Design a protein around this nucleic acid. Structure first.
Lengths: 302, 134, 153, 37
RNA sequence: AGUGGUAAAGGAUGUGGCGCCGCGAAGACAGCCAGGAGGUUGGCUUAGAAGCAGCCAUCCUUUAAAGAGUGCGUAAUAGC
């Protein structure tokens, strides 16, 4: 029993069809159980969505090994991505909350208390000692725990362990536990990357794909300079051509990725950006491709 | 070894959460949950800045005894400062009786820098100002 | 403009309320530790401006206006000027001697001092930590005008 | 940093340095390299 | 400054000049020494404000004369 959990599903997207010959649920299932044999630090769990799974591994990188090996085998899949359920139920997120310090080494007391305190991580108690370290149990929920393991290992530098579980089904409170900064740049339809299209709004942050890179709707193609999200477009790149006439001028270029990693893009998500992976590629789209469709689920108060 | 640190808890409660406390129980002290012992002490002291305040011996221990309320706080402690319930002020429950300030200390004027034969006239004017009684 | 009418009109006022002031270089004490030897002054003395840490040129030269025989005892270095006039100078000298002596490397050394009207000698100001309650000059008169019968016993 | 112009210091105590007709502001923060000569 | 030997907007502890402001020799400012004082200890937030976390506080005693604390900051706090 280690930790971590990466929900699994089926690339029931539009792009067909597609990776190799194993993208449906059946083929996937056969793989899941096949792993529940050799793997010792793996913990496959069943969620609600027939196309979702709570892959509970050990380390943040651990889950990567299985994912990286999946592609080379020929099977595209998104990440993580099994969310939780807000119950129960009248109601407002009654999940649990369990924190655990990670000595310390007073060289992280202010580097770990920030994230926790910034994410509601209520320090139910910081059991200190005469040695030098000091525990820190922050009743955190499954909503503010995800990805935490990663950044955490980057704060204490390995030397920092702490799990959790739950203390009582809450209601999620009233604030969002991220939600990530710098909104993600989404597409407005399938086609291809157009130099004249990606040139315009290029200083509004960073880009992912290139050209003629022809992605689709919902698929992210860079991050926004702010937190807000948008759905630009271009191919088009337009427009050709002549005459007349000539000769000057101008010849905009463009920078490339910025690409990778996985491993460097997965943790990039937050709400619902299934990192659709393939046995030779790795994409990342939102739980709701169509823009207007996203607004359907949000829909906020009250 | 030996060397303790300064600290200021509350005057009434005893529950030792974050005050008694990553402070004492770390830099230098012993045991925790100083709350249970705090209530059996601060109970008779806590409502005008009471410093003691927070240390740690070779036990550690413990509650009992105390200091009192800081100057101003102890000078206008007989007010209510019930305000502050929003922003810096500022309506309802403000005054505390012109004589009260004096009657409240009065006694509440023993432990202080050098000495003071009055903490309700000159002492109040100061502390009181910090609260709202200017 | 600007030093003359302000402060200068109080330096000789609180130091002339009598005739028995002193001078001590106080400063080498932390705000907390310093507020103890001064704040407590009321105990060993009585608000006696035991040199509220004046400065220089202002306190020394001030002697001119008042003409306190020019407390020419020590104007250099720190200048506190223990106002023993505004309080009750006499035997309290000890209350300030041991305090700023038995604590830390030389708490606060002394400087000048006027004995009612005379100039207190530097080396003859400390040993007198206890202002002679007049008994001194009386411990060699009555017991020295009736002791030829004691060697008379 | 430079600019054939601007410069109204910045880093709250950003220095107006006279060097070679070189209007050069010097500070304690690279952010202020003010070269306008 | 080589302006002489073309240029504006506009920028500036340029150069020199006013006609003016600080001089408490109650001997100045940059340079110096030490203390950087006790009520200053919530108001919310107190996981922390107990000036150096956000919505204002504008008082007192007290002396180096007094910071309703201009500032390096985290967990308050602790240090400059």
């Amino acid at each position: 029993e280690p930790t971590v959990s990466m929900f699994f599903c089926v690339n029931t997207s539009p792009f067909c069809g597609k990776e190799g010959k194993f993208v449906t649920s059946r083929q996937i299932l056969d793989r899941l159980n096949k792993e529940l044999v050799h793997n010792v630090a793996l913990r496959v769990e069943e969620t609600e969505d027939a196309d979702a799974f709570r892959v509970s591994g050990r380390g943040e990188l651990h889950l990567s090994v299985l994912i990286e090996n999946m592609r080379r085998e020929g099977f595209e899949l998104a990440v993580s991505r099994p969310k939780v359920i807000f119950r129960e139920i009248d109601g407002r997120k009654q999940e649990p909350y369990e924190n655990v310090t990670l000595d310390v080494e007073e060289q992280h007391q202010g580097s770990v208390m920030q994230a926790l305190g910034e994410r509601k991580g209520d320090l139910k108690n910081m059991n200190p000692d005469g040695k030098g370290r000091v525990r820190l149990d922050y009743v955190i929920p499954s909503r503010g725990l995800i990805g935490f393991r990663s950044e955490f290992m980057t704060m204490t530098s390995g030397t920092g362990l702490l799990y959790s579980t739950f203390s009582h089904y809450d209601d999620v409170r009233p604030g969002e536990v991220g939600q990530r900064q710098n909104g993600v740049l989404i597409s407005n339809g399938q086609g291809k990357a157009v130099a004249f299209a990606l040139f315009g709004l290029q200083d509004r942050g960073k880009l992912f794909l290139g050209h003629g890179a022809e992605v689709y709707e919902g698929q992210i193609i860079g991050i926004h300079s702010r937190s807000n999200d948008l759905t630009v477009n271009c191919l088009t790149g337009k427009k050709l051509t002549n005459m007349r006439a000539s000769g000057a001028d101008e010849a905009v270029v463009l920078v490339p990725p910025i690409r990778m990693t996985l491993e460097q893009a997965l943790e990039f998500i937050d709400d619902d950006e299934l990192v659709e992976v393939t046995p030779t590629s790795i994409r990342i789209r939102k739980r709701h491709l169509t823009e207007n469709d996203r607004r359907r689920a949000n829909r906020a108060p009250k | 070894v030996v060397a303790v640190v300064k600290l200021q808890l509350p005057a009434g409660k005893a529950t030792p959460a974050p005050p008694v406390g990553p402070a004492l129980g770390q830099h230098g002290a012993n045991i925790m949950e100083f709350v249970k012992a705090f209530n059996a002490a601060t109970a008779n002291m806590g409502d005008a800045i009471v410093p003691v305040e927070i240390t740690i011996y070779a036990d550690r221990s413990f509650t009992f005894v105390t200091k009192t309320p800081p100057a101003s706080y102890l000078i206008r402690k007989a007010a209510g400062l019930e305000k502050g319930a929003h922003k810096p002020g500022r309506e309802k429950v403000g005054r505390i009786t012109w004589e009260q300030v004096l009657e409240i200390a009065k006694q509440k004027m023993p432990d202080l820098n050098t000495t003071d034969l009055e903490a309700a006239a000159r002492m109040i004017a100061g502390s009181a100002r910090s609260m709202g009684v200017e | 403009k600007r030093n003359v009418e302000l402060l200068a009109t109080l330096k000789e006022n609180l130091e002339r309320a009598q005739g028995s002031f002193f001078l001590v270089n106080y400063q080498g004490l932390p705000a907390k530790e310093t507020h103890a030897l001064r704040q407590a002054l009321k105990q060993n003395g009585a608000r006696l401006f035991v040199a509220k840490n004046t400065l220089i040129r202002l306190a020394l030269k001030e002697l001119g206006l008042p003409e306190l025989d020019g407390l020419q005892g020590p104007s250099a270095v720190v200048f506190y000027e223990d106002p023993v006039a505004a309080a009750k100078t006499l035997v309290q000298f000890a209350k300030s001697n041991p305090k700023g002596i038995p604590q830390v490397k030389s708490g606060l050394l002394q400087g000048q001092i006027l004995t009612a009207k005379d100039v207190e000698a530097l080396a003859e100001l400390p040993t007198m930590d206890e202002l002679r309650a007049e008994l001194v000059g009386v411990l060699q008169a009555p017991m020295a005008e009736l002791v030829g019968v004691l060697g008379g016993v | 940093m430079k600019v054939r112009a601007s410069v109204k210091r910045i880093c709250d105590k950003c220095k107006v340095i006279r060097r070679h007709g070189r209007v050069y502001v010097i500070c304690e923060n690279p952010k202020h390299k003010q070269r306008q000569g």
